[PDB]
């Protein structure tokens, strides 16, 4: 019965903005009544709250932007999640989903239903469609969407007048985004536009926040996920990759964010479904004038000073006034939880969310204090207030760099690793060599037909993306005696924006983990010959909505999880003629430990680059090797 | 043959963005060739230039915003106007118009064809459609246009799901703009949004600049128009009306524009045809930082200092170095021409256009120095760079207030009027009384069907506008002996934003001329009983494109000229309970003096309020009377 | 050596009068700035920064020492020019002089020492234009058209003026790198100032009529193909 259930849940994601077209779903929406069917829900309080909200009309109006950073939106989405998750039977769950689809905003319903499907036992096999297919308007420029609407409604008669559009195959018409948006931010935004505007990266951020919502309290499974450590590690990896891209395109180090003025602005060029332009941050934005920006920055400074005091003093304050030490090396998780100010933080009243205030300030979304129903505020969020568009703005990377400065301060106070924790007896690496590192640009097609308001075709968008050829890394190692070992590869830049070789201690923060795997080392001489195509950290493209629908309706793979980095974004572009980089191979013992499942050997994720490392403490540690490589770009 | 010619010229304005659909026009476009038909054009140089431009493709690309402030755009539009105007026969003119419609940008073609029709003898009867019907996208928000597209393409099946839209009559569907755009500039922009965003006002500005393009040199007819005096008078009238509106809504005096920072920003909420959002000026914009704004402001300061020096020294410098005096009272025209820096200015090389630089600076249109054909720059103009959207921004009023400060400086140097120039023998005004002054808001419908890309309905937009009830002004006057006299009425505010009564000398700059007419005064007692419905200065609404098309195809009025203020914008709103104003009745002798035709008694348009006036010099002048009135607003 | 050949304090003779001093000045400055921009693009530094009248972001530390052993003046980063300092007065004088030059360029004539107007609208007036901009001893009127480039150099050298004099006479000065021709080119501020002067020159050239197809064409001479063997550079 998997196929039919998946088909129905897909039909729930066919046209969010438009109303229900399938008749029996209308019958269910008109027939079901929560009041009399309270007995089928475990959480009766959620049922009462939902009934009250739906009766008083105290809900976010339909056809309006939705943001989780607003309090009332969080309350509404949490209540709906509690109601949906408390469904005893799958039938009750589906019937509540239909009713909410009828009586709930599109974005909120999609998000809550996806979260419920991911975290429900009865729906551990259902596959949810990609976000960039349900709402294409968050990943393509407004001109593209308007042209799509025109070419569709024209009946493809004036389409042949358009030279940009073309018919690649029957029933599909494709455009070019190569020639468009001549007006753009420029500054530091254009050279890295092939990485920051990538659809897959924003989709990955959205899916990550689907797996770990800020408004959802962890269960036994989510309590072993080490939420804070994942936050820190993922932010570090993203910032290291972004810095590598900037060095590749010659833009320099990530600008440091102050408290007086921000020089770089952002113009999104995106449009909401209704047609409201996004807020724009001007260049040379002033933060020390008579504006709400000043008050927001003062609150941000207070909260960050509280975090700094907690880090330095070595303990945090409970909600009653007790001191809880965080000086042990295993307190990184609670530190991250406190910094994030999620619902799992011990004390959110004193440790508040300054990152959201940073996002509000640097989004320059004019607060007009407008409310509907004498209730829910009406907000026009900027790109930074949406996880599916935040990564397009450099300000996000600047803010995360500040948070990573806080994290580095905390890690600095920790004792440095010893020659016993960081050494494996009688394992010496001889030589490490990669076959080649080449990158090239290629074309890809995305389906944006779900935005078209069909009455009674399939428009696609062509985009340019980076990719790399398969590469093999071969290392020879002395093994001493037989062992079961783990090998980790790290990649870092070798020269900074000016030309001086970066010391290893500084590079410790710029090392990007690209592969980790097990091996059984024999006695004597060995050979590791890892191929990039075998790594499980990076995955291939997930099947599109159309492909999944075809494979389902016509009637598995475990190499496509929503919480993995796309393969084509693993390797930096480099330069034509070669760009130098540093590879680091580290071998350690194997210390023995589907929607949201990731686990490796029990140890800090960034080991051994989480703490600062110095050359003088690597003498006597032979199982770590630092080689130099060159990354090339194939021009086309 | 008027009807058929008008029908064809209307068909030339049916779908600018879309290509030619009528077959014989395609045949003409494919058959006509300028090279062999040079003999039918008087200006052969224009023919050669047009041929060269069309062969080299050195022209503005189609489907791109067009602005006259750019040099190459001016050159192209001037060349096309020269080509069209040099058509010996009407047939040649129409055949060139079709060819250009086929091979020219939409906005440029519409503008040039309208100008040619207005200034051509063979087309002095043709009536051109309103601008707000040809390009509705410049007068309504992007959300409205997107909703229109959706309701049209949906086949009016999901339209009935929309509660906003409704069917007022057969074949027409109407919306509401009352509930939309909750995100808005606020500050000083919302309380006067009913006046600054009025469609008729922007259309009036566009038609005025159609009558007097900056790139067209005047002929005998246009040389008697006193271009500079018209510029000054119209700007003064607009600023006085805007100040009256601000006082009515309690916003205060027009802010003074400096050279360091502009506090008030603007968000248009408009979208171009393709779907590119308009530039946004942030609040508290800084002009004294390391930006191109500083250089632009320095050039502006240099040019304005040149103007100030020319005004103070009493003479202007010719292109050879000669001094030409401007100290006479009849030099206002050349002064205005110099300030405007039009093609009729004596010396544009030394006296340059600083107002355009002000518009560029305060539009905050990011210059990205992008060019097509290795030629024509690509520009995304702001609202201030288009005459059909400039009036929506307060910065325009601030800039015009600065220019009016320059004009007031010039007028101050002139000698004050005497008791002989300002007096009429034996004519004493006894009493002046108006019956009532009431204002109310009403609904109106605009047709935006021409934007819809119909394949193989008629959507309308409902807007709220101000209007007034008919009022009668009755004055009793002693006449002495029989005479033929002219009576002028002026309206001004009585109290400023704080509460002090404004002295007459300051109010001289705030007097708005509302009526001027002739009369024959008898001997003894007389009675003037003017009714607002008789004034010819203000006109009624012009027939829409649909109405004109119906009246033409089915098969005159002279009270509808494109260069007259709409009647409903004549009177300030006032306040509920009454707002005090000052009326001034002035009687003078009758000194004896269709597309663009306006002439009155030979005298300065702003007489006697062009020069400063003082109470002590009005003793002995009995033919001028100052009464007080109250304007009321009917709330609904 | 160039300033040895054409000193600002030496009046030209028959030989130096055929040298077209102003045109040489303009051409050499343009060539230097084009080469510098090519170098910047080669090393990925971007376009030459535009010099304003409020603040200069880039500073300079020479690292040089005079014969006696006095360190050179240092310009700090983010130097402020709109505060209560002599920099403001110097910048005001610079602005006045540059506005005088702009007015002379736009009006089409220059003012003599007596008050006469001399036209500069012909294409062969580039030499006198350069002489006026340089304010050398060969300029027609140095009293009205003064040397603003020297004031720019003084301002951007940040040489602290201490008003010290010897013999009750000759001032004692510690010049910066910009005040010496043998060290001026080490500072980007020089290139910025010359870019401003070249903006003035480009304004003047823009007012000139564009070349025609008769001045710019040679009858019956068509170029087929151009090819270079190789372009390689090494340290
Ligand atoms: C079915 O559906 C419903 C609806 O969908 C779901 O209901 C939600 O359920 C969750 C979980 O139960 C609730 O969250 C918790 O709520 C309680 C109660 O908060 C309410 O009352 C507060 C006022 O009383 C509190 O303060 C007064 C003094 O002023 C005090 O006398 C009283 O005893 C009590 O402490 C309100 O303040 C509060 O909301 C107000 O304040 C908020 C904060 O400023 C503000 O945001 C609100 O807008 C409003 O202004 C609310 O009305 C909370 O006590 C509890 O708080 C814990 O977690 C937060 C972080 O999320 C943390 O900051 C707190 O310090 C506290 O942390 C303790 O518990 C954590 C786990 O919950 C634990 O991880 C911490 O370590 C800590 O516990 C450990 O340490 C502490 C000492 O630090 C120790 O005492 C403990 O024993 C332990 O050792 C949560 O916020 C939602 O409120 C509720 N929502 C609704 C709408 O119903 C329901 O979950 C669904 N059920 C099922 C089965 O699915
Ligand atoms: C058929 O089609 C064609 C194409 O559609 C139409 O052609 C257009 O026709 C108009 C009108 O004829 C032209 O405008 C006039 O152009 C002339 C010539 O300008 C050209 O040449 C300039 C260079 O030569 C000038 O300077 C040199 C020195 O450097 C000097 O030696 C030479 O004698 C001459 O003076 C170029 O500079 C100029 O363009 C360049 O410069 C522009 C300005 O910076 C710049 O914008 C350009 O981009 C380019 O860089 C061009 O190539 C102009 O002389 C004439 O200028 C008058 O008007 C302007 C204001 O518009 C004003 O500033 C000038 O000072 C001058 O004013 C005198 O004439 C006015 C009337 O024209 C008059 O109102 C003024 O009072 C003044 O006249 C009185 O006072 C003066 C003293 O101040 C005195 O001398 C007079 O005798 C009199 O007493 C116009 O700009 C278009 O150029 C032309 N365009 C094209 C593409 O062909 C044609 O009209 C159509 N024909 C028909 C029948 O329909
Ligand atoms: C042997 O050794 C000695 C020492 O080594 C050498 O002596 C040097 O020789 C040179 C060349 O002769 C001198 O330069 C010229 O000096 C004269 C005189 O200037 C002195 O007097 C001025 C005051 O009198 C002036 O103003 C009053 C009104 O106030 C007026 O009534 C009077 O008639 C006269 O006009 C002083 O102001 C001046 O110094 C003061 O002012 C300076 C400027 O502010 C200031 O710097 C000083 O610090 C001081 O404050 C001085 O004491 C100048 O008249 C002459 O000026 C010309 O050149 C300059 C640019 O260098 C230009 O600005 C002037 O406008 C003027 O330009 C005319 O002549 C140019 C050629 O000389 C020519 O190119 C111009 O086109 C122009 O000529 C043409 O147009 C004009 C109209 O514009 C027209 O009248 C002409 O007929 C013609 O058509 C020079 O500065 C040195 O002063 C002198 N130095 C010393 C220490 O002796 C000597 O050269 C050696 N001899 C040999 C054979 O080798
Ligand atoms: C893009 O996605 C749409 C679904 O949003 C696809 O629509 C399908 O088109 C095929 C055409 O043969 C139909 O048989 C299916 O029934 C359609 N499905 C739905 C849900 O409408 C469309 O084919 C996709 N196009 C591409 C190129 O992937
Ligand atoms: C709005 O304007 C359009 C033209 O842009 C009008 O279209 C006309 O509609 C009538 C309907 O009976 C047709 O007979 C005409 O042939 C149409 N003209 C064109 C040029 O298409 C439309 O009627 C107008 N609607 C309103 C309410 O004024
Ligand atoms: Cu969408
Ligand atoms: Cu700044
Ligand atoms: Cu339009
Ligand atoms: Cu401010
Ligand atoms: Cu600074």
Angle between helices A71-85 and A44-56 (to 10 degrees): 130
Asked whether the beta carbons of A292 and B284 are under 8 A apart, the reply is no
CA proximity to A257, closest of A407, A405, A402, A409: A402
- Distance between the two ends of chain B, CA-based, in angstroms? 49
CA proximity to A174, closest of A378, A433, A445, A391: A445
Three-state secondary-structure class, residue A530: strand
Distance from CA of B376 to the nearest CA of A (A): 13
Give chain B's count of helices (H) and strands (E): 18, 17
Three-state secondary-structure class, residue A491: strand
Bridge partners, B575 (sequence order):
B632
Q: Enumerate the H helices of B555-615 as residue ranges.
A: none
**Kind and range of the H or E run holding A513:** strand A512-521
**Cα distances (Å, whole numbers) of residue A182 to A185, B281, B291, B377, B570:** 10, 20, 21, 11, 43
Q: Rounded to an integer, what is the distance from CA B310 to the centroid of its chain? A: 28
CA proximity to B302, closest of C104, C150, C192: C104
Largest separation between any pair of C-alpha atoms in chain B: 77
CA–CA separation, A32 and A83 (whole Å): 14
Asked whether the beta carbons of A9 and A120 are under 8 A apart, the reply is no
Q: Rounded to an integer, what is the distance from CA A318 to the centroid of its chain? A: 31
Nearest-CA residue for ligand 4 atom 8 is A546
**Cα distances (Å, whole numbers) of residue C146 to A249, C137, C141:** 45, 11, 8
Q: Enumerate the H helices of A418-520 as residue ranges.
A: 504-507
**Cα distances (Å, whole numbers) of residue C149 to B260, C34, C152:** 26, 20, 5
Per the document, the length of chain A is 636
Asked whether the beta carbons of B491 and B450 are under 8 A apart, the reply is no
CA proximity to B269, closest of A233, A277, A122: A277
Q: Enumerate the H helices of B434-524 as residue ranges.
A: 504-507
**Cα distances (Å, whole numbers) of residue C28 to C8, C25, C34, C145:** 16, 5, 10, 22
- Residue B2's Cβ-side half-sphere holds a number of Cα atoms within 13 Å equal to 9
Query: What six digits make up the tokens of A628?
Result: 């130099």
CA–CA separation, B116 and B106 (whole Å): 15
Contacts of A388 (CB under 8 A, 6+ apart): A131, A135, A138, A139, A202, A203, A205, A206
- Residue B75's Cβ-side half-sphere holds a number of Cα atoms within 13 Å equal to 11
Bridge partners, A65 (sequence order):
none
Asked whether the beta carbons of B451 and B414 are under 8 A apart, the reply is no
- Distance between the two ends of chain C, CA-based, in angstroms? 25
Instruction: Give the strand order in the sheet containing A459-468.
Output: A166-169, A172-174, A459-468, A438-447, A624-633, A579-589, A483-493, A512-521
Q: Rounded to an integer, what is the distance from CA B422 to the centroid of its chain? A: 31
Three-state secondary-structure class, residue B322: coil
Q: Rounded to an integer, what is the distance from CA B477 to the centroid of its chain? A: 37
CA–CA separation, C168 and A229 (whole Å): 74
CA–CA separation, B424 and B624 (whole Å): 10
Query: What six digits make up the tokens of C172?
Result: 């004692």
Bridge partners, A485 (sequence order):
A519, A589
Question: Which is it for strands B624-633 and B438-447: parallel, antiparallel or unpaired?
Answer: parallel
Nearest CA in chain C to B291: C52
Resolution for this PDB entry, in angstroms: 2.8
CA proximity to B561, closest of B198, B109, B208, B123: B208
DSSP letter (8 states) at residue B331: G
**Cα distances (Å, whole numbers) of residue A78 to A22, A72, A257:** 28, 10, 33
CA–CA separation, C32 and B160 (whole Å): 70
Chain C residues whose beta carbon lies within 8 Å of the beta carbon of residue B289: 54-55
Asked whether the beta carbons of residue A157 and residue B182 sit closer than 8 angstroms, the reply is no
DSSP letter (8 states) at residue C1: -
Asked whether the beta carbons of B3 and B550 are under 8 A apart, the reply is no
Tell me the backbone φ, ψ of residue A116, rounded to 5 degrees: -65, -45
**Cα distances (Å, whole numbers) of residue C26 to A565, C47, C76, C134:** 56, 20, 30, 10
Query: What six digits make up the tokens of B267?
Result: 């968000």
Asked whether the beta carbons of A480 and A425 are under 8 A apart, the reply is yes
Contacts of A290 (CB under 8 A, 6+ apart): none
- Distance between the two ends of chain A, CA-based, in angstroms? 49
Q: Is the CB of B43 under 6 A from ligand 2?
A: yes
Asked whether the beta carbons of B485 and B588 are under 8 A apart, the reply is yes
Cis bond leading into A608, ω under 30°? yes
Distance from residue A307's CA to the centre of ligand 7 (Å): 29
Asked whether the beta carbons of B522 and B482 are under 8 A apart, the reply is yes
Asked whether the beta carbons of A176 and A462 are under 8 A apart, the reply is yes
Residue A18 forms contact with B (CB below 8 Å):
yes
Beta strands in B384-527 (DSSP E): 428-434, 438-447, 459-468, 472-478, 483-493, 512-521
CA–CA separation, A217 and A221 (whole Å): 11
Sign of CA dihedral A123, A125, A126, A128: positive
Asked whether the beta carbons of residue A289 and residue B285 sit closer than 8 angstroms, the reply is no
CA–CA separation, B317 and B323 (whole Å): 5
Sign of CA dihedral B195, B199, B200, B206: positive
CA-derived radius of gyration, chain B: 26
Contacts of A98 (CB under 8 A, 6+ apart): A12, A20, A25, A28, A29, A32
Asked whether the beta carbons of A498 and A468 are under 8 A apart, the reply is no
Q: Rounded to an integer, what is the distance from CA A430 to the centroid of its chain? A: 38
Query: What six digits make up the tokens of B236?
Result: 């003064």
Q: Which chains have 3 or more CB–CB distances shorter than 8 Å to chain C? A: B
Query: What six digits make up the tokens of A40?
Result: 């089928």
Query: What six digits make up the tokens of B515?
Result: 């009526």
Asked whether the beta carbons of A89 and A73 are under 8 A apart, the reply is no
Nearest-CA residue for ligand 2 atom 90 is B343
- Residue A279's Cβ-side half-sphere holds a number of Cα atoms within 13 Å equal to 28
CA–CA separation, A522 and A526 (whole Å): 7
Question: Which is it for strands A172-174 and A459-468: parallel, antiparallel or unpaired?
Answer: parallel
Question: Exposure of A31 by Cβ count < 10 A (0-12 exposed, 13-18 middle, 19+ buried)?
Answer: exposed
CA–CA separation, B405 and B397 (whole Å): 12
Task: Count CB atoms within 10 A of the CB of residue B592.
Answer: 7
Distance from residue C118's CA to the centre of ligand 2 (Å): 21
Name the residue with tokens 């703009």: B177
Query: What six digits make up the tokens of B209?
Result: 């600049």
**Kind and range of the H or E run holding B31:** helix B23-31
What torsion do the CA atoms of B244, B246, B250, B256 make, to the nearest 10 degrees? -120
Question: Which is it for strands B512-521 and B483-493: parallel, antiparallel or unpaired?
Answer: antiparallel
CA–CA separation, A327 and A412 (whole Å): 11
Asked whether the beta carbons of A141 and A177 are under 8 A apart, the reply is yes
Nearest-CA residue for ligand 4 atom 15 is A546
CB pairs A-B closer than 8 Å: 109
**Kind and range of the H or E run holding A582:** strand A579-589
Buried b (16+ CB within 10 A) or exposed e, B102-133: bebbbbbbbbbbbbbbbbbeebeebbbbbbbb
Would you list the DSSP string of B54-92?
HHHT-SPPSSS---TTSHHHHHHHHHHHHHHHTBSSHHH
Asked whether the beta carbons of residue B277 and residue A291 sit closer than 8 angstroms, the reply is no
CA–CA separation, B128 and C167 (whole Å): 85
CA proximity to C90, closest of C157, C12, C186, C143: C157
Sign of CA dihedral A254, A260, A262, A263: negative
Task: Count CB atoms within 10 A of the CB of residue A183.
Answer: 19
Pick from C9, C113, C114 the residue to mutate for probing ligand 3's pocket: most ligand atoms within 8 Å of its CB.
C113
Three-state secondary-structure class, residue A519: strand
Q: Is B412 left (phi over 0), alpha (psi -120 to 50) or beta?
A: alpha
Task: Count CB atoms within 10 A of the CB of residue B236.
Answer: 24
Q: Rounded to an integer, what is the distance from CA A73 to the centroid of its chain? A: 21
Task: Count CB atoms within 10 A of the CB of residue A182.
Answer: 14
Sign of CA dihedral A183, A189, A192, A193: negative
Query: What six digits make up the tokens of B592?
Result: 């004896």
CA–CA separation, A176 and A158 (whole Å): 17
Asked whether the beta carbons of A388 and A200 are under 8 A apart, the reply is no
Q: Identify the experimental approach.
A: cryo-EM
Name the residue with tokens 């098309």: B549
Distance from residue A357's CA to the centre of ligand 9 (Å): 21
CA proximity to A237, closest of A516, A574, A23: A516
Tell me the backbone φ, ψ of residue A502, rounded to 5 degrees: -80, 125
CA proximity to A277, closest of A389, A368, A369, A141: A141
Chain B residues whose beta carbon lies within 8 Å of the beta carbon of residue A146: 274-275
Q: Which residues in chain B have their C atom more than 2.5 Å from the N of the next written residue, marking a break after them?
A: 456, 555, 593
Contacts of C96 (CB under 8 A, 6+ apart): none
Distance from residue B525's CA to the centre of ligand 6 (Å): 75
What percentage of chain C's residues is helix, strand, coil (to nearest 5)?
40, 5, 50
* Residue among B56, B309, B320 with most chain C CBs within 10 A, to mutate: B320
Tell me the backbone φ, ψ of residue B397, rounded to 5 degrees: -65, -35
Asked whether the beta carbons of B380 and B279 are under 8 A apart, the reply is yes
């Amino acid at each position: 019965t998997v196929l039919d259930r998946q088909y129905k849940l897909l039909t729930l994601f066919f046209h969010p903005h438009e109303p229900i077209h399938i008749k029996e779903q209308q019958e269910i929406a008109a027939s079901w009544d929560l009041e009399k069917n309270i007995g089928l829900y475990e959480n009766a309080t959620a049922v009462h709250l939902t009934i009250q909200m739906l009766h008083n009309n105290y809900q976010v109006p339909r056809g309006v932007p939705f943001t989780v950073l607003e309090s009332v939106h969080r309350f509404e989405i949490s209540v709906y999640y509690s109601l949906l998750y408390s469904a005893k039977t799958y039938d009750t769950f589906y019937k509540t989903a239909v009713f909410l689809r009828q009586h709930v905003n599109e974005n909120l319903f999609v998000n809550v239903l996806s979260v419920v499907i991911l975290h429900r036992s009865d729906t551990q096999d259902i596959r949810i469609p990609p976000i960039y297919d349900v709402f294409p308007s968050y990943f393509h420029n407004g001109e593209i969407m308007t042209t799509a609407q025109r070419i569709t409604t024209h009946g493809q008669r004036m389409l042949e007048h358009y030279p940009s559009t073309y018919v690649w195959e029957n029933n599909v018409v494709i455009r070019h985004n190569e020639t468009a948006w001549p007006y753009y931010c420029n500054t530091e935004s254009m050279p890295v536009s092939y990485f920051t505007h990538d659809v897959t990266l924003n989709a990955l951020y959205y899916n990550i926040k689907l797996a770990y919502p800020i408004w959802l309290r962890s269960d036994a499974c989510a309590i072993k996920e080490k939420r804070g450590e994942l936050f820190f590690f993922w932010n570090k990896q993203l910032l290291a990759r972004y810095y590598m891209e900037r060095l590749s395109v010659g833009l320099g180090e990530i600008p440091e964010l102050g408290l007086n003025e921000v020089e770089e602005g952002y113009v999104s060029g995106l449009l909401y479904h209704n047609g409201i332009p996004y807020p724009v941050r001007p260049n040379h934005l002033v933060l020390n004038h008579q504006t709400w920006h000043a008050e927001a920055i003062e609150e941000i400074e207070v909260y960050e000073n509280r975090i700094r005091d907690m880090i330095d003093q070595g303990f945090y304050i409970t909600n009653t006034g007790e001191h809880v030490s965080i000086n042990s090396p295993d307190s990184i998780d609670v530190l991250g939880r406190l910094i994030e100010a999620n619902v799992d933080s011990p004390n959110v009243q004193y440790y508040k969310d300054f990152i959201s205030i940073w996002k509000k300030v640097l989004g320059n979304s004019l607060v007009h204090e407008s409310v509907a129903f004498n209730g829910i505020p009406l907000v026009v969020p900027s790109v930074l207030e949406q996880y599916q568009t935040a990564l397009r703005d450099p300000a996000y990377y600047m803010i995360m760099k500040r948070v990573l400065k806080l994290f580095n301060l905390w890690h600095e106070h920790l004792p440095h690793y010893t020659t016993k924790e960081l050494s494996v007896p009688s394992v010496k690496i001889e030589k490490v060599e990669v076959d080649k590192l080449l990158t090239y640009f290629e074309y890809t097609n995305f389906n944006v037909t779900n935005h078209l308001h069909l009455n009674e075709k399939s428009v696609l968008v062509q985009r340019t993306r980076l990719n790399h050829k398969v590469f093999t890394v071969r290392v020879n190692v002395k093994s001493g005696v037989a062992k079961h070992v783990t090998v980790r590869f790290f990649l870092a830049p070798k020269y900074d924006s000016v030309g001086n070789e970066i010391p290893l201690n500084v590079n410790t923060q710029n090392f990007l983990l690209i592969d980790i795997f097990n091996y059984e080392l024999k006695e004597g001489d060995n050979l590791i010959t890892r191929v990039s195509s075998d790594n499980l950290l990076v995955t291939d493209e997930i099947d599109s909505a159309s492909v999944l629908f075809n494979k389902v309706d016509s009637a598995l793979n475990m190499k496509q999880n929503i919480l993995k980095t796309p393969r084509h974004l693993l390797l930096p572009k480099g330069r034509v003629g070669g760009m130098p980089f540093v590879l680091m191979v580290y071998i350690s013992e194997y210390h023995a430990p589907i929607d949201n499942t990731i686990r490796l050997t029990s140890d800090t994720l960034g080991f051994p680059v989480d703490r600062p490392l110095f050359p003088w403490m690597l003498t006597g540690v032979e199982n770590i090797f630092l080689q130099d490589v060159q990354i090339y770009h194939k021009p086309t």
